[PDB]
Amino acid sequence: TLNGGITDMLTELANFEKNVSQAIHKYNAYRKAASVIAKYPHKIKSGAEAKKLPGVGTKIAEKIDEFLATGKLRKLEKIRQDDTSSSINFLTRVSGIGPSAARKFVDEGIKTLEDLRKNEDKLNHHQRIGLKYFGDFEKRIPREEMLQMQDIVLNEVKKVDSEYIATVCGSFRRGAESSGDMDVLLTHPSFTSESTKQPKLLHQVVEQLQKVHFITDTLSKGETKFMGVCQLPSKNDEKEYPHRRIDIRLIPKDQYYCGVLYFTGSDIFNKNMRAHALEKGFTINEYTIRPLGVTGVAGEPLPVDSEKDIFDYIQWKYREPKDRSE
DNA sequence: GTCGG
DNA sequence: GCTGATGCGCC
DNA sequence: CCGACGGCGCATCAGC
Ligand SMILES: Nc1ccn([C@H]2C[C@H](O)[C@@H](COP(=O)(O)OP(=O)(O)OP(=O)(O)O)O2)c(=O)n1
Ligand SMILES: *CC[C@H](OP(*)(=O)O)[C@H](O)COP(=O)(O)O
Ligand SMILES: [Mg+2]
Ligand SMILES: [Mg+2]
Ligand SMILES: [Mg+2]
Ligand SMILES: [Mg+2]
């Protein structure tokens, strides 16, 4: 609601920089500005008011002044009218089509949904599945369906080995009423930072979920990360549920707190927290928090016994998952 | 595009 | 076959 | 002004 006009404007500029300009730092700058404006609890009355927030500079203030006076941004009005920008912005909505592949396809005269379904032989495995479920993948998952999905995954993993722990992360763990997809963090005692005492720990879980027809497709799979497609079972005479994206990440059992911090997000929160860690002389990834030596070389992993320990190292007050959303 | 040294 | 670069993905 | 901007997994390809 509040400042929705401004944040939508900034998100559309971010998407343009990422998809068309291939300018990843401008994309990140627009998104950081959109997120700080979304959390601001007043109706922004001027560019000058917004410029006081961290991540809003001169250029964004000037665009906020235009938007508030005219309800439009001339630059976005032009981009919307541009056939190449339009085509690329549409193709990048297909899972597996990034900015580079989108520009290549536009060059070959492939620029609509009809063009893609004619040219499937030109798509890689991932792109083919993104095309097949194009409609399904733009739908959000109601929390009630996420609870049904949680119950299937936790119960199936438990049937494979009572020592697995599966945790639903992403927007679900931040308490969202709807989720873009299902993100599952997996641990097993056999996989630690010190040892892999067992092979196929991720594979055996994927296989069981395929066997009860929950996982329907694979986009990618290695030893620690699965990316694919799943679907809730429906009743007699009921319309089928949409196909959903599922990500599964197997994390060393001893590095759970770093792993769950990473997988809980949001992505903007992780970028902000990791950028703050560097200013405080630390580096954070999904496994460890490590000091930076005078060098700029990461040192030994610091002890972590809680999510909050990570916040304490970088001198942040703890934020509950619910308070890490945009 | 913005920030901090 | 291996290794390093790049694309696309995740939060 | 100007260098840095988060960090890493898997798929794919060029060069040896
Ligand atoms: N054809 C080019 C253009 C630029 N550069 C280099 C020179 C500078 O080190 C840097 C950018 O210089 P610019 O004059 O482009 O500076 P800005 O990017 O700030 O200005 P502009 O508003 O023109 O983008 O890239 C280059 O090597 N070859
Ligand atoms: C939004 C205004 C732009 O800020 P950035 O460094 O992307 C520039 O001031 C205008 O640049 P252009 O419109 O992309 O040439
Ligand atoms: Mg996309
Ligand atoms: Mg998600
Ligand atoms: Mg996901
Ligand atoms: Mg915790």
mmCIF file of C-alpha atoms (C1' of nucleotides) and ligand atoms in Angstrom:
data_model
loop_
_atom_site.group_PDB
_atom_site.id
_atom_site.type_symbol
_atom_site.label_atom_id
_atom_site.label_comp_id
_atom_site.label_asym_id
_atom_site.label_seq_id
_atom_site.Cartn_x
_atom_site.Cartn_y
_atom_site.Cartn_z
ATOM 1 C CA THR A 1 0.000 0.000 0.000
ATOM 2 C CA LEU A 2 2.159 2.912 1.355
ATOM 3 C CA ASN A 3 4.567 4.308 -1.332
ATOM 4 C CA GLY A 4 3.551 1.311 -3.581
ATOM 5 C CA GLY A 5 3.670 3.605 -6.644
ATOM 6 C CA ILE A 6 7.350 4.516 -5.962
ATOM 7 C CA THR A 7 8.453 0.927 -5.041
ATOM 8 C CA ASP A 8 6.763 -0.531 -8.212
ATOM 9 C CA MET A 9 8.544 2.165 -10.314
ATOM 10 C CA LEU A 10 11.930 1.230 -8.748
ATOM 11 C CA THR A 11 11.325 -2.571 -9.169
ATOM 12 C CA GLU A 12 10.519 -2.046 -12.924
ATOM 13 C CA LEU A 13 13.785 -0.016 -13.300
ATOM 14 C CA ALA A 14 15.704 -2.764 -11.394
ATOM 15 C CA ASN A 15 14.233 -5.430 -13.741
ATOM 16 C CA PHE A 16 15.237 -3.304 -16.799
ATOM 17 C CA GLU A 17 18.839 -2.924 -15.593
ATOM 18 C CA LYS A 18 19.126 -6.676 -14.842
ATOM 19 C CA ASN A 19 17.324 -8.046 -17.908
ATOM 20 C CA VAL A 20 18.067 -5.478 -20.742
ATOM 21 C CA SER A 21 21.112 -3.394 -19.608
ATOM 22 C CA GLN A 22 22.752 -6.450 -17.899
ATOM 23 C CA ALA A 23 23.805 -3.929 -15.137
ATOM 24 C CA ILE A 24 23.754 -6.043 -11.927
ATOM 25 C CA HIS A 25 24.954 -3.190 -9.575
ATOM 26 C CA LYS A 26 22.206 -0.804 -10.855
ATOM 27 C CA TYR A 27 19.672 -3.680 -10.419
ATOM 28 C CA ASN A 28 20.914 -4.126 -6.779
ATOM 29 C CA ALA A 29 20.883 -0.305 -6.174
ATOM 30 C CA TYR A 30 17.236 0.035 -7.365
ATOM 31 C CA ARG A 31 16.113 -3.002 -5.226
ATOM 32 C CA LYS A 32 17.942 -1.732 -2.092
ATOM 33 C CA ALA A 33 16.202 1.686 -2.591
ATOM 34 C CA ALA A 34 12.779 0.017 -3.188
ATOM 35 C CA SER A 35 13.175 -2.058 0.011
ATOM 36 C CA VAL A 36 14.195 0.892 2.265
ATOM 37 C CA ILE A 37 11.252 2.954 0.852
ATOM 38 C CA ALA A 38 8.794 0.009 1.403
ATOM 39 C CA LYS A 39 9.717 -0.082 5.196
ATOM 40 C CA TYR A 40 9.433 3.762 5.591
ATOM 41 C CA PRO A 41 6.252 4.385 7.633
ATOM 42 C CA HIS A 42 5.206 7.801 6.041
ATOM 43 C CA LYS A 43 3.721 8.692 2.571
ATOM 44 C CA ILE A 44 6.768 10.149 0.764
ATOM 45 C CA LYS A 45 5.883 13.792 -0.196
ATOM 46 C CA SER A 46 9.156 14.650 -2.123
ATOM 47 C CA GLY A 47 12.436 13.325 -3.614
ATOM 48 C CA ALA A 48 14.241 15.325 -0.853
ATOM 49 C CA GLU A 49 12.354 13.347 1.881
ATOM 50 C CA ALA A 50 13.347 10.000 0.216
ATOM 51 C CA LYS A 51 16.999 11.119 -0.323
ATOM 52 C CA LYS A 52 17.440 11.014 3.549
ATOM 53 C CA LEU A 53 17.005 7.178 3.484
ATOM 54 C CA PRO A 54 20.119 4.969 2.994
ATOM 55 C CA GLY A 55 20.331 3.678 -0.629
ATOM 56 C CA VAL A 56 18.363 6.678 -2.101
ATOM 57 C CA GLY A 57 20.740 9.083 -3.932
ATOM 58 C CA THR A 58 20.272 12.084 -6.261
ATOM 59 C CA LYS A 59 19.107 10.143 -9.357
ATOM 60 C CA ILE A 60 16.382 8.220 -7.439
ATOM 61 C CA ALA A 61 15.231 11.438 -5.686
ATOM 62 C CA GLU A 62 14.814 13.088 -9.146
ATOM 63 C CA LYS A 63 12.842 10.133 -10.392
ATOM 64 C CA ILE A 64 10.611 10.265 -7.257
ATOM 65 C CA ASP A 65 9.984 14.037 -7.980
ATOM 66 C CA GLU A 66 8.905 13.200 -11.615
ATOM 67 C CA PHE A 67 6.729 10.275 -10.427
ATOM 68 C CA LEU A 68 4.951 12.298 -7.657
ATOM 69 C CA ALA A 69 4.197 15.247 -10.039
ATOM 70 C CA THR A 70 3.138 13.196 -13.175
ATOM 71 C CA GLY A 71 2.284 9.671 -11.824
ATOM 72 C CA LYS A 72 4.581 8.310 -14.595
ATOM 73 C CA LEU A 73 8.292 8.046 -15.416
ATOM 74 C CA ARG A 74 9.128 9.132 -19.040
ATOM 75 C CA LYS A 75 12.085 6.601 -19.017
ATOM 76 C CA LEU A 76 9.763 3.648 -18.179
ATOM 77 C CA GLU A 77 7.099 5.009 -20.691
ATOM 78 C CA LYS A 78 9.869 4.744 -23.440
ATOM 79 C CA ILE A 79 11.155 1.267 -22.263
ATOM 80 C CA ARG A 80 7.514 -0.071 -22.289
ATOM 81 C CA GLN A 81 7.208 1.148 -25.986
ATOM 82 C CA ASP A 82 10.601 -0.406 -27.020
ATOM 83 C CA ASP A 83 10.041 -3.772 -28.903
ATOM 84 C CA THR A 84 13.524 -5.230 -27.977
ATOM 85 C CA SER A 85 13.251 -4.277 -24.222
ATOM 86 C CA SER A 86 9.642 -5.626 -24.197
ATOM 87 C CA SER A 87 10.664 -8.941 -25.860
ATOM 88 C CA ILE A 88 13.634 -9.435 -23.468
ATOM 89 C CA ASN A 89 11.515 -8.542 -20.359
ATOM 90 C CA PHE A 90 8.968 -11.225 -21.484
ATOM 91 C CA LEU A 91 11.525 -14.016 -22.316
ATOM 92 C CA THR A 92 13.386 -13.557 -18.990
ATOM 93 C CA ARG A 93 10.093 -14.560 -17.191
ATOM 94 C CA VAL A 94 10.691 -18.185 -18.429
ATOM 95 C CA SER A 95 12.752 -20.201 -15.872
ATOM 96 C CA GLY A 96 16.201 -20.864 -17.436
ATOM 97 C CA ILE A 97 16.063 -17.849 -19.823
ATOM 98 C CA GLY A 98 18.412 -15.202 -18.450
ATOM 99 C CA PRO A 99 19.438 -11.845 -19.959
ATOM 100 C CA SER A 100 22.044 -13.411 -22.289
ATOM 101 C CA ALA A 101 19.781 -16.205 -23.673
ATOM 102 C CA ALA A 102 16.846 -13.691 -24.008
ATOM 103 C CA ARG A 103 18.932 -11.344 -26.284
ATOM 104 C CA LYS A 104 20.143 -14.406 -28.379
ATOM 105 C CA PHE A 105 16.485 -15.608 -28.853
ATOM 106 C CA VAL A 106 15.309 -12.076 -29.868
ATOM 107 C CA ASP A 107 18.221 -12.109 -32.444
ATOM 108 C CA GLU A 108 16.854 -15.386 -33.929
ATOM 109 C CA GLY A 109 13.299 -13.847 -34.184
ATOM 110 C CA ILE A 110 12.089 -15.907 -31.110
ATOM 111 C CA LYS A 111 10.239 -13.300 -28.982
ATOM 112 C CA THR A 112 6.712 -14.572 -28.012
ATOM 113 C CA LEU A 113 5.146 -17.533 -26.185
ATOM 114 C CA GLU A 114 4.066 -18.892 -29.641
ATOM 115 C CA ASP A 115 7.735 -18.579 -30.915
ATOM 116 C CA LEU A 116 9.018 -20.626 -27.910
ATOM 117 C CA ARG A 117 6.454 -23.472 -28.364
ATOM 118 C CA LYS A 118 7.490 -23.655 -32.108
ATOM 119 C CA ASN A 119 11.239 -23.823 -31.226
ATOM 120 C CA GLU A 120 11.451 -26.233 -28.248
ATOM 121 C CA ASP A 121 14.379 -28.014 -30.014
ATOM 122 C CA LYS A 122 16.327 -24.687 -29.425
ATOM 123 C CA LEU A 123 15.620 -24.844 -25.601
ATOM 124 C CA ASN A 124 17.823 -26.622 -23.009
ATOM 125 C CA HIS A 125 16.197 -28.992 -20.446
ATOM 126 C CA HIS A 126 15.644 -26.230 -17.836
ATOM 127 C CA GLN A 127 14.113 -23.810 -20.417
ATOM 128 C CA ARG A 128 11.782 -26.591 -21.713
ATOM 129 C CA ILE A 129 10.388 -27.115 -18.152
ATOM 130 C CA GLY A 130 10.161 -23.300 -17.631
ATOM 131 C CA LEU A 131 8.111 -23.098 -20.869
ATOM 132 C CA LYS A 132 5.906 -26.130 -19.950
ATOM 133 C CA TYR A 133 4.949 -24.534 -16.563
ATOM 134 C CA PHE A 134 5.170 -20.828 -17.550
ATOM 135 C CA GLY A 135 1.653 -20.074 -16.198
ATOM 136 C CA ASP A 136 1.978 -22.235 -13.038
ATOM 137 C CA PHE A 137 5.372 -20.681 -12.044
ATOM 138 C CA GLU A 138 3.926 -17.095 -11.977
ATOM 139 C CA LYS A 139 1.256 -18.153 -9.395
ATOM 140 C CA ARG A 140 1.996 -17.704 -5.637
ATOM 141 C CA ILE A 141 1.446 -20.587 -3.168
ATOM 142 C CA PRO A 142 -1.078 -19.886 -0.363
ATOM 143 C CA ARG A 143 0.353 -20.635 3.148
ATOM 144 C CA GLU A 144 -2.374 -23.372 3.542
ATOM 145 C CA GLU A 145 -0.877 -25.260 0.509
ATOM 146 C CA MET A 146 2.687 -24.637 1.854
ATOM 147 C CA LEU A 147 1.532 -26.379 5.132
ATOM 148 C CA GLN A 148 0.217 -29.385 3.087
ATOM 149 C CA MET A 149 3.557 -29.453 1.138
ATOM 150 C CA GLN A 150 5.572 -29.248 4.446
ATOM 151 C CA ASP A 151 3.603 -32.206 5.836
ATOM 152 C CA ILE A 152 4.364 -34.403 2.715
ATOM 153 C CA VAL A 153 8.082 -33.505 2.630
ATOM 154 C CA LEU A 154 8.721 -33.908 6.425
ATOM 155 C CA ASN A 155 6.763 -37.235 6.506
ATOM 156 C CA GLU A 156 8.513 -38.632 3.358
ATOM 157 C CA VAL A 157 12.051 -37.653 4.577
ATOM 158 C CA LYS A 158 11.261 -39.331 7.956
ATOM 159 C CA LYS A 159 10.266 -42.564 6.020
ATOM 160 C CA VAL A 160 13.787 -42.527 4.372
ATOM 161 C CA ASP A 161 15.760 -42.005 7.680
ATOM 162 C CA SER A 162 14.446 -40.758 11.091
ATOM 163 C CA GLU A 163 17.830 -38.873 11.452
ATOM 164 C CA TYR A 164 17.170 -36.417 8.533
ATOM 165 C CA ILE A 165 15.793 -33.005 9.624
ATOM 166 C CA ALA A 166 14.004 -31.000 6.867
ATOM 167 C CA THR A 167 13.233 -27.326 7.564
ATOM 168 C CA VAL A 168 11.039 -25.194 5.224
ATOM 169 C CA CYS A 169 12.851 -21.852 4.797
ATOM 170 C CA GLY A 170 12.418 -18.808 2.489
ATOM 171 C CA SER A 171 9.300 -16.625 2.757
ATOM 172 C CA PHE A 172 7.491 -19.559 4.488
ATOM 173 C CA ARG A 173 9.876 -19.371 7.529
ATOM 174 C CA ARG A 174 9.497 -15.522 7.510
ATOM 175 C CA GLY A 175 5.737 -16.131 8.116
ATOM 176 C CA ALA A 176 4.491 -14.996 4.636
ATOM 177 C CA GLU A 177 0.757 -15.624 3.873
ATOM 178 C CA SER A 178 1.890 -16.681 0.320
ATOM 179 C CA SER A 179 5.245 -18.042 -1.094
ATOM 180 C CA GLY A 180 6.813 -17.954 -4.560
ATOM 181 C CA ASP A 181 8.145 -21.545 -4.156
ATOM 182 C CA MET A 182 9.146 -24.165 -1.565
ATOM 183 C CA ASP A 183 12.711 -23.977 -0.085
ATOM 184 C CA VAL A 184 13.826 -27.018 1.980
ATOM 185 C CA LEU A 185 17.002 -27.113 4.088
ATOM 186 C CA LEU A 186 18.073 -30.740 4.760
ATOM 187 C CA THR A 187 20.600 -32.062 7.337
ATOM 188 C CA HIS A 188 21.689 -35.624 8.202
ATOM 189 C CA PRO A 189 24.289 -36.556 10.883
ATOM 190 C CA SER A 190 26.344 -38.454 8.225
ATOM 191 C CA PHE A 191 27.192 -35.149 6.404
ATOM 192 C CA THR A 192 29.300 -32.641 8.428
ATOM 193 C CA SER A 193 32.003 -30.048 7.587
ATOM 194 C CA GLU A 194 34.501 -32.808 8.637
ATOM 195 C CA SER A 195 33.112 -35.905 6.814
ATOM 196 C CA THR A 196 30.733 -37.438 4.224
ATOM 197 C CA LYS A 197 30.183 -40.850 5.957
ATOM 198 C CA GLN A 198 27.331 -41.699 3.493
ATOM 199 C CA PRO A 199 26.777 -41.173 -0.280
ATOM 200 C CA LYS A 200 23.397 -40.286 -1.998
ATOM 201 C CA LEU A 201 21.994 -38.459 1.091
ATOM 202 C CA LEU A 202 20.230 -35.831 -1.144
ATOM 203 C CA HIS A 203 19.536 -38.398 -3.951
ATOM 204 C CA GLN A 204 17.674 -40.847 -1.630
ATOM 205 C CA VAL A 205 15.307 -38.006 -0.498
ATOM 206 C CA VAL A 206 14.661 -36.763 -4.115
ATOM 207 C CA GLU A 207 14.022 -40.447 -5.180
ATOM 208 C CA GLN A 208 11.395 -40.997 -2.368
ATOM 209 C CA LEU A 209 9.641 -37.684 -3.264
ATOM 210 C CA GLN A 210 9.592 -38.776 -6.970
ATOM 211 C CA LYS A 211 8.212 -42.206 -5.928
ATOM 212 C CA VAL A 212 5.123 -40.703 -4.143
ATOM 213 C CA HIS A 213 4.713 -38.443 -7.294
ATOM 214 C CA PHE A 214 5.435 -35.206 -5.294
ATOM 215 C CA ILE A 215 8.558 -34.228 -7.351
ATOM 216 C CA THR A 216 7.412 -34.274 -11.049
ATOM 217 C CA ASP A 217 10.526 -32.758 -12.786
ATOM 218 C CA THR A 218 14.272 -31.981 -12.241
ATOM 219 C CA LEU A 219 15.836 -28.650 -13.393
ATOM 220 C CA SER A 220 19.272 -29.474 -11.818
ATOM 221 C CA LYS A 221 20.740 -31.874 -9.227
ATOM 222 C CA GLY A 222 24.115 -32.389 -7.555
ATOM 223 C CA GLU A 223 25.396 -33.682 -4.229
ATOM 224 C CA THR A 224 24.123 -30.697 -2.170
ATOM 225 C CA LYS A 225 21.452 -28.792 -4.251
ATOM 226 C CA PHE A 226 18.274 -29.970 -6.040
ATOM 227 C CA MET A 227 16.173 -27.575 -8.168
ATOM 228 C CA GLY A 228 12.910 -28.963 -9.565
ATOM 229 C CA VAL A 229 9.119 -29.060 -9.738
ATOM 230 C CA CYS A 230 6.522 -30.547 -7.376
ATOM 231 C CA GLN A 231 2.692 -30.775 -7.123
ATOM 232 C CA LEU A 232 0.183 -31.503 -4.324
ATOM 233 C CA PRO A 233 -2.133 -34.462 -4.911
ATOM 234 C CA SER A 234 -5.782 -33.470 -5.673
ATOM 235 C CA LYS A 235 -9.100 -35.302 -4.772
ATOM 236 C CA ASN A 236 -11.577 -37.265 -6.987
ATOM 237 C CA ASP A 237 -13.158 -34.848 -9.568
ATOM 238 C CA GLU A 238 -11.023 -31.850 -8.313
ATOM 239 C CA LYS A 239 -9.020 -29.523 -10.644
ATOM 240 C CA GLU A 240 -5.267 -30.361 -10.232
ATOM 241 C CA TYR A 241 -3.105 -27.976 -8.121
ATOM 242 C CA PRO A 242 -0.568 -25.886 -10.141
ATOM 243 C CA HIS A 243 3.013 -27.232 -10.506
ATOM 244 C CA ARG A 244 5.363 -25.471 -8.027
ATOM 245 C CA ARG A 245 9.147 -24.781 -7.899
ATOM 246 C CA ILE A 246 11.013 -26.716 -5.142
ATOM 247 C CA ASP A 247 14.623 -26.115 -4.011
ATOM 248 C CA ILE A 248 16.357 -28.591 -1.605
ATOM 249 C CA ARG A 249 19.733 -27.711 -0.039
ATOM 250 C CA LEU A 250 21.691 -30.307 1.983
ATOM 251 C CA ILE A 251 23.890 -28.393 4.493
ATOM 252 C CA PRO A 252 26.590 -29.789 6.841
ATOM 253 C CA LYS A 253 24.730 -30.648 10.102
ATOM 254 C CA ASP A 254 27.241 -28.655 12.230
ATOM 255 C CA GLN A 255 26.732 -25.538 9.940
ATOM 256 C CA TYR A 256 22.890 -25.501 10.330
ATOM 257 C CA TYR A 257 22.658 -21.909 11.829
ATOM 258 C CA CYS A 258 24.657 -20.306 8.942
ATOM 259 C CA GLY A 259 22.640 -22.474 6.504
ATOM 260 C CA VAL A 260 19.207 -21.501 7.938
ATOM 261 C CA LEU A 261 20.189 -17.806 8.116
ATOM 262 C CA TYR A 262 21.128 -17.987 4.385
ATOM 263 C CA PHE A 263 18.019 -19.969 3.308
ATOM 264 C CA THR A 264 15.570 -17.820 5.390
ATOM 265 C CA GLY A 265 16.581 -14.602 3.534
ATOM 266 C CA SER A 266 15.109 -12.450 2.175
ATOM 267 C CA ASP A 267 17.797 -12.050 -0.568
ATOM 268 C CA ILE A 268 17.888 -8.215 0.063
ATOM 269 C CA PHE A 269 18.318 -8.907 3.833
ATOM 270 C CA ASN A 270 21.224 -11.379 3.111
ATOM 271 C CA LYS A 271 22.932 -8.810 0.809
ATOM 272 C CA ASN A 272 22.475 -6.088 3.489
ATOM 273 C CA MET A 273 23.721 -8.385 6.346
ATOM 274 C CA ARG A 274 26.751 -9.718 4.331
ATOM 275 C CA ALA A 275 27.647 -6.105 3.233
ATOM 276 C CA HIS A 276 27.444 -5.038 6.962
ATOM 277 C CA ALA A 277 29.661 -8.045 7.990
ATOM 278 C CA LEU A 278 32.385 -6.874 5.491
ATOM 279 C CA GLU A 279 32.272 -3.280 6.963
ATOM 280 C CA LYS A 280 32.672 -4.971 10.434
ATOM 281 C CA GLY A 281 35.648 -7.117 9.145
ATOM 282 C CA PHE A 282 33.803 -10.480 8.715
ATOM 283 C CA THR A 283 32.614 -12.616 5.768
ATOM 284 C CA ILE A 284 29.370 -14.656 6.013
ATOM 285 C CA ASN A 285 28.327 -17.484 3.647
ATOM 286 C CA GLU A 286 25.834 -20.351 4.133
ATOM 287 C CA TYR A 287 28.486 -22.385 6.077
ATOM 288 C CA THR A 288 30.584 -20.029 8.250
ATOM 289 C CA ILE A 289 31.326 -16.574 9.581
ATOM 290 C CA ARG A 290 35.076 -15.870 9.333
ATOM 291 C CA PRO A 291 37.176 -12.798 10.225
ATOM 292 C CA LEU A 292 39.006 -10.907 7.430
ATOM 293 C CA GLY A 293 42.815 -10.718 8.068
ATOM 294 C CA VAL A 294 44.731 -7.426 7.324
ATOM 295 C CA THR A 295 45.361 -9.184 3.914
ATOM 296 C CA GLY A 296 41.665 -9.329 2.956
ATOM 297 C CA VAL A 297 42.068 -13.135 3.393
ATOM 298 C CA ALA A 298 39.285 -14.882 5.413
ATOM 299 C CA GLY A 299 40.539 -16.543 8.664
ATOM 300 C CA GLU A 300 39.207 -19.586 10.584
ATOM 301 C CA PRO A 301 35.447 -20.084 11.108
ATOM 302 C CA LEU A 302 34.123 -18.527 14.374
ATOM 303 C CA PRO A 303 32.012 -20.673 16.771
ATOM 304 C CA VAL A 304 28.239 -20.375 16.025
ATOM 305 C CA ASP A 305 25.711 -21.923 18.453
ATOM 306 C CA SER A 306 22.630 -19.880 17.341
ATOM 307 C CA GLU A 307 21.351 -17.633 14.517
ATOM 308 C CA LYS A 308 21.700 -14.741 17.061
ATOM 309 C CA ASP A 309 25.473 -15.466 17.500
ATOM 310 C CA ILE A 310 25.938 -14.388 13.843
ATOM 311 C CA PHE A 311 24.077 -11.063 14.514
ATOM 312 C CA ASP A 312 26.204 -10.558 17.735
ATOM 313 C CA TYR A 313 29.530 -10.870 15.803
ATOM 314 C CA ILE A 314 28.504 -8.018 13.393
ATOM 315 C CA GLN A 315 26.927 -5.997 16.272
ATOM 316 C CA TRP A 316 23.314 -6.166 14.944
ATOM 317 C CA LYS A 317 20.318 -6.526 17.308
ATOM 318 C CA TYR A 318 18.657 -9.892 16.491
ATOM 319 C CA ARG A 319 15.882 -9.794 13.820
ATOM 320 C CA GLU A 320 13.239 -12.559 13.887
ATOM 321 C CA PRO A 321 12.642 -14.197 10.447
ATOM 322 C CA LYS A 322 9.314 -12.261 10.227
ATOM 323 C CA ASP A 323 11.368 -8.988 10.362
ATOM 324 C CA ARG A 324 13.774 -10.033 7.469
ATOM 325 C CA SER A 325 11.137 -9.605 4.657
ATOM 326 C CA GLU A 326 10.770 -6.641 2.133
ATOM 327 C "C1'" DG B 1 23.071 4.053 -8.923
ATOM 328 C "C1'" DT B 2 24.903 4.686 -4.169
ATOM 329 C "C1'" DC B 3 28.082 4.949 -0.542
ATOM 330 C "C1'" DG B 4 32.372 5.826 2.221
ATOM 331 C "C1'" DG B 5 37.177 6.869 2.570
ATOM 332 C "C1'" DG C 1 38.929 -35.947 -18.993
ATOM 333 C "C1'" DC C 2 40.223 -31.692 -16.285
ATOM 334 C "C1'" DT C 3 40.126 -26.816 -15.137
ATOM 335 C "C1'" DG C 4 38.535 -22.009 -15.364
ATOM 336 C "C1'" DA C 5 35.030 -18.859 -17.245
ATOM 337 C "C1'" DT C 6 30.371 -17.711 -17.753
ATOM 338 C "C1'" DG C 7 25.247 -18.118 -17.441
ATOM 339 C "C1'" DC C 8 21.398 -18.812 -14.416
ATOM 340 C "C1'" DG C 9 19.927 -20.130 -10.308
ATOM 341 C "C1'" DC C 10 19.133 -19.685 -4.824
ATOM 342 C "C1'" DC C 11 18.391 -16.824 -0.277
ATOM 343 C "C1'" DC D 1 36.725 11.251 -7.294
ATOM 344 C "C1'" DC D 2 36.500 6.126 -7.601
ATOM 345 C "C1'" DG D 3 36.425 1.173 -6.213
ATOM 346 C "C1'" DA D 4 33.413 -1.852 -4.234
ATOM 347 C "C1'" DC D 5 28.997 -3.628 -4.434
ATOM 348 C "C1'" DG D 6 27.330 -11.204 -1.057
ATOM 349 C "C1'" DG D 7 28.481 -15.589 -1.726
ATOM 350 C "C1'" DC D 8 28.107 -20.001 -3.751
ATOM 351 C "C1'" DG D 9 25.775 -24.565 -6.509
ATOM 352 C "C1'" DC D 10 24.984 -26.720 -10.964
ATOM 353 C "C1'" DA D 11 24.992 -26.669 -16.235
ATOM 354 C "C1'" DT D 12 27.531 -25.688 -20.185
ATOM 355 C "C1'" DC D 13 31.490 -24.732 -23.113
ATOM 356 C "C1'" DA D 14 36.527 -23.490 -24.761
ATOM 357 C "C1'" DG D 15 41.099 -24.645 -24.465
ATOM 358 C "C1'" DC D 16 44.645 -28.038 -23.513
HETATM 359 N N1 LIG E 1 35.412 3.690 -24.825
HETATM 360 C C1 LIG E 1 35.831 3.754 -23.558
HETATM 361 C C2 LIG E 1 35.076 4.452 -22.565
HETATM 362 C C3 LIG E 1 35.560 4.498 -21.306
HETATM 363 N N2 LIG E 1 36.721 3.870 -20.972
HETATM 364 C C4 LIG E 1 37.255 3.928 -19.590
HETATM 365 C C5 LIG E 1 37.877 5.273 -19.235
HETATM 366 C C6 LIG E 1 37.493 5.475 -17.778
HETATM 367 O O1 LIG E 1 38.504 4.903 -16.955
HETATM 368 C C7 LIG E 1 36.163 4.726 -17.664
HETATM 369 C C8 LIG E 1 34.918 5.576 -17.803
HETATM 370 O O2 LIG E 1 35.258 6.929 -18.260
HETATM 371 P P1 LIG E 1 34.041 7.875 -18.717
HETATM 372 O O3 LIG E 1 34.556 9.137 -19.341
HETATM 373 O O4 LIG E 1 33.064 7.047 -19.483
HETATM 374 O O5 LIG E 1 33.340 8.221 -17.312
HETATM 375 P P2 LIG E 1 31.847 8.002 -16.759
HETATM 376 O O6 LIG E 1 31.417 6.594 -17.022
HETATM 377 O O7 LIG E 1 31.797 8.534 -15.363
HETATM 378 O O8 LIG E 1 31.021 8.985 -17.724
HETATM 379 P P3 LIG E 1 29.720 8.820 -18.687
HETATM 380 O O9 LIG E 1 28.679 9.778 -18.140
HETATM 381 O O10 LIG E 1 30.160 9.186 -20.087
HETATM 382 O O11 LIG E 1 29.300 7.371 -18.581
HETATM 383 O O12 LIG E 1 36.176 3.713 -18.700
HETATM 384 C C9 LIG E 1 37.464 3.200 -21.955
HETATM 385 O O13 LIG E 1 38.536 2.666 -21.620
HETATM 386 N N3 LIG E 1 36.988 3.150 -23.236
HETATM 387 C C1 LIG E 2 17.951 7.146 -13.792
HETATM 388 C C2 LIG E 2 18.989 8.158 -14.255
HETATM 389 C C3 LIG E 2 20.280 7.479 -14.641
HETATM 390 O O1 LIG E 2 20.910 7.137 -13.427
HETATM 391 P P1 LIG E 2 22.028 5.904 -13.555
HETATM 392 O O2 LIG E 2 23.819 6.110 -13.395
HETATM 393 O O3 LIG E 2 21.440 4.456 -14.359
HETATM 394 C C4 LIG E 2 21.179 8.398 -15.474
HETATM 395 O O4 LIG E 2 21.289 9.676 -14.844
HETATM 396 C C5 LIG E 2 20.653 8.587 -16.889
HETATM 397 O O5 LIG E 2 21.273 7.597 -17.701
HETATM 398 P P2 LIG E 2 20.564 6.952 -19.007
HETATM 399 O O6 LIG E 2 19.164 7.533 -19.032
HETATM 400 O O7 LIG E 2 20.611 5.447 -18.771
HETATM 401 O O8 LIG E 2 21.483 7.449 -20.111
HETATM 402 MG MG MG E 3 13.857 -14.484 -14.978
HETATM 403 MG MG MG E 4 11.307 -19.190 -2.057
HETATM 404 MG MG MG E 5 13.365 -21.227 -4.164
HETATM 405 MG MG MG E 6 17.524 -20.952 14.520
#
